Amino acid sequence: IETVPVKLKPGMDGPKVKQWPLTEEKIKALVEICTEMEKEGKISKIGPENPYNTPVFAIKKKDSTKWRKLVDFRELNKRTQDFWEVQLGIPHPAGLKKKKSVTVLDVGDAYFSVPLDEDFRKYTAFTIPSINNETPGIRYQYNVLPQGWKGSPAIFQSSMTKILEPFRKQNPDIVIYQYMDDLYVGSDLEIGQHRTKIEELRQHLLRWGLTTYELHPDKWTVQPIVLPEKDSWTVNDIQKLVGKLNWASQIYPGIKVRQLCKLLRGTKALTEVIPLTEEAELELAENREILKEPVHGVYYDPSKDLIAEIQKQGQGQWTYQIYQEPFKNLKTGKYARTNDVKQLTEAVQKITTESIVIWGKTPKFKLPIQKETWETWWTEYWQATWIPEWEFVNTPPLVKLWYQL
């Protein structure tokens, strides 16, 4: 094939990211995998004249017992964003979120059959560490398009198009979207018809590169901020209600509270019961009406980053909001059903997947957890071929409450 030259944003040097500690079984796995990739010429060993590094991990392929190499190219991708977004970007179809069934397929094996621009390879350096630092790391770079680098799909773009043309021509009412290592394939077929068409697509893919799960996006609906309807009300109940509407009012135009406050008049005990008024009973219904709806006035700005906040609700339930501008929610939701980190990890991948389908973009996550706990454990349950950006926050206990139920 023909090597397409690549360039970093002017000034920016390559990634010099430290390698996180790996358990023995993950190191062993990485050595097998890399010895085999080297034999096949996909990667080559490198000397100390290469100052760059990006982290590398081992994960178990989604539904499958078998170790897989996961390279963390978040830094490189950030430093390459001129290349994979502006020069050769993949357009994201608005029709994908519309389909009844979307299937995700790994097409990462595609990239290893294509050479990487030689003047770029040094930036793809990574290090397999050793236990207790008893031997120097084993160091490689890529000779072909690496998985996980946003440049790879940008470059392989015209090859993918040639591969998909027949299947696309024969099935016009099917949307296929490439994002990183995955192919998203949506249709409105009945589920058996949909699955059949995926297999045919696997065969097309098979004549080039692939081995020998289904979203239902148009069935995604927001998790409305929920206002209870109760038997009787206490003072405490009303205040908790006011605080909650008070918070919605900062997002949804038209939210009203005034009638409820009138109920609080005076300085009375917390458990006391208080009579329910028509003005309140109505205003309450009027608000509850607005929470069911899209936020009037909020719209996706393609130029701006996506952000996802996640609150631990307890009993295995998690809530989350996606926004570009704080409090202006493009999507809210919940994830449900062991282990606090295993669940958070599952919620992050699920939220990321939906983000890819809806916007073609991945969110920066605000994660309610100690950095070090997350760093240690996340790979133990991670199954995606990508890695979202994240930071760590202490959840405002009030935010948690307003998104209950």
Add this chain to the structure above:
Amino acid sequence: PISPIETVPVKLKPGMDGPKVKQWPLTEEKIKALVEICTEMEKEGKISKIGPENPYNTPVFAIKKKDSTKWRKLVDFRELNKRTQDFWEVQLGIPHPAGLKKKKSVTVLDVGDAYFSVPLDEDFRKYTAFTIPSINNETPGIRYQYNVLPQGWKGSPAIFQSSMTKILEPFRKQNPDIVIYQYMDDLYVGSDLEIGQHRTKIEELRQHLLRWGLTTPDKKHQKEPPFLWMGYELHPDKWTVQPIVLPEKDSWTVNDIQKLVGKLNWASQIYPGIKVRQLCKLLRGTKALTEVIPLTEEAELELAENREILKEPVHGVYYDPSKDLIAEIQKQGQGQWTYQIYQEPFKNLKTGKYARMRGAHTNDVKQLTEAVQKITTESIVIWGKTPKFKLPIQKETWETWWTEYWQATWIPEWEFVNTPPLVKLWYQLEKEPIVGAETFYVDGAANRETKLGKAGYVTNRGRQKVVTLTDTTNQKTELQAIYLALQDSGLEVNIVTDSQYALGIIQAQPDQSESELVNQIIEQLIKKEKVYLAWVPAHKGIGGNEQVDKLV
């Protein structure tokens, strides 16, 4: 003496050209020593004479060696170094003794003339050019360049270590059972063979080394146990830290206390129970190095107890990968934690301590979990697996706290061990408003410019009270208001605040804090029999909130 191994290609940083520093004029004897030294280096291949066509130069000097009458050349590579490409890091961590597989034999081999024994990229040599000035700078000086890795150049540690790795490689392949640790210009080589076969395998490794340009000591000259390395004393089947002496002093200076703490911290990886909190407190508001700091009675108590711990020599064991890894943690008080890691009780691979304060306010359950994360990471680094923990907290205490707390967590497999003090929760807030309990609506305020502030409460029983506060902050007063309400309330209380900031602090159920206020509140919360804490939005005309709002 100059390895036949292929060179690492090297570059200057992309925008830059090689150094051009002017050679200062030297003395006659300095000039003489250098010509002597350089002639001997030139014969061995280390350096070469070059023409005047080479534009590059970096300064050389000579200083009399070790007070003796030997001279050492000394090249100043600061300028070339600033222009040389960045390299990859030699090591990203250093091995810990506790992580070493036990071996029947280990011998030490040092490489002689390590840097000078390794070639330098042909294309880069012209950048290492230096000039021995002629006397009084009358005539053109003598110009050489390096053919090998210079001492003091930026790339030499890294190109050396990688050259050796390339050389060791095939011998590793044919001897997969043999352990070789590369450290600077030492090799540590270890086997489970019997002396003779080991003696054999060594001289065979020496031989592979010599085919490659590397001279090593012979049997007569190879050093003996214990091996002293990285501040450790490594005997054949136990290890410890190198000898530690705690000075006797009538009085301590800043600098004395820093070195004390450095030694204690270092001793703490095998002497269990070391403490430095009270000594570190003295270091606060750091003054002059020479300054005398009188010891508090608590620092004196601490030094004394450390003194006893270090009284009798302790040692550590090496790692048997077939056995399991157990880790035990004990509370030592005031955010201080100590741990031991063994495989067979109670023979420690290593020990440690954890003191860190993550946050301004915490409780023991949070600190214990943080200490577990720390020890887990350390275990992954050192042994490549997580230990089985034995923790001083009930499965129910921990279950209760972490299911209810808003942050996620997950410690590896642990089990409870009864090693007081146990970690417990000292109070729990209530889930529901309390019937029959007085409801306090509290509030606080601080004038941003005057910094003066009022704090107080209003009650459903008509009670009321407000106080004045000098030089405080809006945050400080809102905690004052909550504290007031606790002091003046009975054993059961509802409290209503509009401070998310106070709520957050209290909701998380701290049992220790840097704020004295927050410790006072904590004393109160523990003495109470029931507290329910609620939040209302400010300035919304909510009930009692507005009353106390204007009051303050």
